[PDB]
DNA sequence: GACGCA
């Protein structure tokens, strides 16, 4: 669906198959509150090769898992610092969950 | 602004 934003977004793309191995994960910070899950998938699928987006309940953060590094880096370049549906995003390479 | 609710 159309996103309320003045950012020029690519068209929606198919997600990657669910069992595709992750090649890059993004860390997302929301201000002032998180976006709905279906809206987040809408935004992040447009860069291609999206596996899934998920949220951390009770916090203003989420993650986006990509099957392709170029797609994930395009999401960073296009979305970091922008306002989508009234929410300012920070989008960056995530720290690994473990050593 | 940090590790996937009820």
Numbering used by the authors: 369 to 467
Excerpt from the publication:
RBM45 is an RNA-binding protein with roles in neural development by regulating RNA splicing. Its dysfunction and aggregation are associated with neurodegenerative diseases such as amyotrophic lateral sclerosis (ALS) and frontotemporal lobar dementia (FTLD). RBM45 consists of three RNA-recognition motif (RRM) domains, two at the N-terminus (RRM1 and RRM2) and one at the C-terminus (RRM3), and a pseudo-RRM domain in the middle. In this work, we identified that the C-terminal RRM domain of human RBM45 (RBM45RRM3) sequence specifically binds GACG sequence RNA and solved the crystal structures of RBM45RRM3 in apo form and in complex with a single-stranded DNA that mimicked the recognized RNA.
To explore the RNA-recognition mechanism of RBM45RRM3, we attempted to co-crystallize RBM45RRM3 with RNA or ssDNA containing GACG sequence and finally solved the crystal structure of RBM45RRM3 in complex with an ssDNA 7-mer, 5′-GACGCAG-3′, at a resolution of 1.65 Å. There are also four RBM45RRM3 molecules per asymmetric unit, however, the space group and the packing pattern of the complex crystal are totally different from those of the protein-alone crystal. The final model includes the first six nucleotides of the ssDNA 7-mer, hereafter named from G1 to A6. The ssDNA binds to the positively charged β-sheet surface of RBM45 with its 5′ end bound to the β4 side and its 3′ end bound to the β2 side of the β-sheet, consistent with the conventional RNA binding pattern of RRMs. Superimposition with the protein-alone structure shows that the C-terminal loop of RBM45RRM3 in the complex structure is in a different direction. This loop is directly involved in the interaction with ssDNA, suggesting that the conformational change is most likely a result of ssDNA binding. Specifically, G1 binds to a hydrophobic patch formed by the side chains of Phe395 and Val397 in β1 and Met460 in β4; a γ-methyl of Val397 side chain contacts the purine ring of G1 via the CH–π interaction; the side-chain amino group of Lys458 in β4 forms hydrogen bonds with N7 and O6 of G1. The purine ring of A2 π–π stacks with the aromatic side chain of Phe395; the N1 and N3 of A2 form hydrogen bonds with the main-chain amino group of Asp463 in the C-terminal loop and the side-chain hydroxyl group of Tyr431 in β3, respectively; the N6 forms a hydrogen bond with the main-chain carbonyl group of Leu461 via a water molecule. The hydroxyl group of Tyr431 contacts the pyrimidine ring of C3 through OH–π interaction; two side-chain amino groups of Arg393 in β1 form hydrogen bonds with O2 and N3 of C3; the main-chain carbonyl group of Asp463 forms a hydrogen bond with N4 of C3. For G4, its purine ring π–π stacks with the side chain of Tyr422, whereas its N1 and N2 form two hydrogen bonds with the side-chain carboxyl group of Glu420 in β2 and its O6 forms a hydrogen bond with the side-chain amino group of Lys433 in β3.
